[PDB]
Structure formats: structure tokens, C-alpha cells
Amino acid sequence: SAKVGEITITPDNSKPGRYISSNPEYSLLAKLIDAESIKGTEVYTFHTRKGQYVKVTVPDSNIDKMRVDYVNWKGPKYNNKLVKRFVSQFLLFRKEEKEKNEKEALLKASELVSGMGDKLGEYLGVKYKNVAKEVANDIKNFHGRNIRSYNEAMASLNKVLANPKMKVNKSDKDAIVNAWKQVNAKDMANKIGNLGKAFKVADLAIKVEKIREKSIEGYNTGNWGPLLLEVESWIIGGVVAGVAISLFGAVLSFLPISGLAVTALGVIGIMTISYLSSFIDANRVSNINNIISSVIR
């Protein structure tokens, strides 16, 4: 709901990635704008008329490499400077918006993780509670310029996974799974959504659903790649690293423990905590491994 030079851009609450121009006169004669960021390239779509639009693409957010495309254009083409004028600011606004949301997300996510700490710790032990808290902190203070690679993360996860004590008997496995299935993406999505504007990403419920399905599959197959990959997916697809993670954590934390035993609890607690550190801090993982002993039987 900020001001972009001469006008005021407002984010369409109803539709993520879409903005409203206070005065189309300065927004290329378009009231509605749709922004996108795939693989670091910003893409602006100005809806001038029905079925008509101007596509603006900014490779690597470098206005110098800017490209304009008139699609289904009837009339004369706007002069570049004009376009440039607006884009410049919009670009800038966009960055700020992200930066803001990122911080906003990490915080709220760190809270959730922290609380999860307090909660499970009552059953799991102080050692558990202690680590969870650090993990929460790491989240709180993370910068998106250090989000780890799939292969990078996957490795760390293995350490935990490869940890002998880190066992999972069917009785437990089947519960954990049953828990996951108990989940309703939609409700989740709303739940998550209500955490704040920053969580209002596109196709929330799909993202949720995929976390569930892949979460389940991980359990009964030991394959966790799909999970990590999904998250990474999100990011390449436009979601800011900080948010993606936060989003991830939130979901993770929203799983229902009713119907699980203290043993299953430990698994869950460890897992959650582990996935997260895997993407953030390699070192925290050690910490986790060290407490697996006292948490898991």
C-alpha cells in the first residue's frame, strides 16, 4: 500500500502477485499489474485493455537489460523512457516489499518453532527444548543469501538419518503417517494464511498438500529428497528464501500430535527441527544428533 513516485501501488489482497495503480496515467495506462519473479528475473504485466497488455521483463532485476513486449496491441507503442520511468520505481518497491516480508516471516516462524520447543519439551525433555530454541533463533536471524542447496541440505539430513538411535518402529511410523493424512490443506492454508500478509503466497493450499504427500512418502520410504526438493521448488518459483522456510516451518509445526506416543513425538520433534537446520545451519545439525540419544528411547 506504498507510494511509487507519483502514484500509489496497492497489493491486491484477493490475488497474490497483483497490484493496483492509484492513477493508471503513470502506470502505463494500466490499473492492474501482475508481478513475477522466476529464477531472479522480474516480470511485469500491465493490463491495459481486455486481452491486451504490456509485458515488461527485467532480467536479474537489472533495468539495463529491460525488455518490453506489446501483446495484442492496437495503437502506438509507448516511448521507452516512459516505461523506464515507472519500472524503475516499481522494481525498487518490489525489492523493499520482499525484504520486509522476509523479516516478517522469519520472526513469526521463529516464534512457532520456539513454542513448539516449549510444548514438546514438556514430554520430550529439556535437552530437546533447548535445541529447538536455538533452531528458532537461527531462523529468526537468517538472511536469504545463505539458503542451502538441495544436495547440500540432503547431506546434512543424512547425518541425522544415519544416526543409529534414529529408529522408527511401524507402530510409530503408522501413527505419524496417520497424523499427516488427518491434515486438511485448506484449513491449514487458512491457518497459515492468518499468520500474516507475508504468508499470503500463491497456491498456498497446493504447497501445503505437497508437503503432506511428500511428508508421508518420506516416512514409508526413507526418501526425503522430494520434500527438500519441493521447498527449493517454491523458491525458484518466486517465493523468497526466508518465506519459503518460514512457510515450511509453520506447516511442520501445525501437525497434530494427538494420537502419537512419546516415542513418535521424539521422531517428529527431531525431524522438524532437522529439516529446518538442514537448509540453514550445517552446524546446528551436530547439536541435534547429540541429543538424539536422550530423546529417542
UniProtKB/Swiss-Prot annotation:
Keywords: Antibiotic, Antimicrobial, Bacteriocin, Cell membrane, Membrane, Plasmid, Transmembrane, Transmembrane helix. It is a multi-pass membrane protein. Signal peptide: none annotated. It comes from the Bacteria. It is found in: Cell membrane. GO terms for molecular function: pore-forming activity; transmembrane transporter binding. This is Colicin-N. It comes from Escherichia coli. The chain holds residues 91 to 387 of 387 of the full protein.
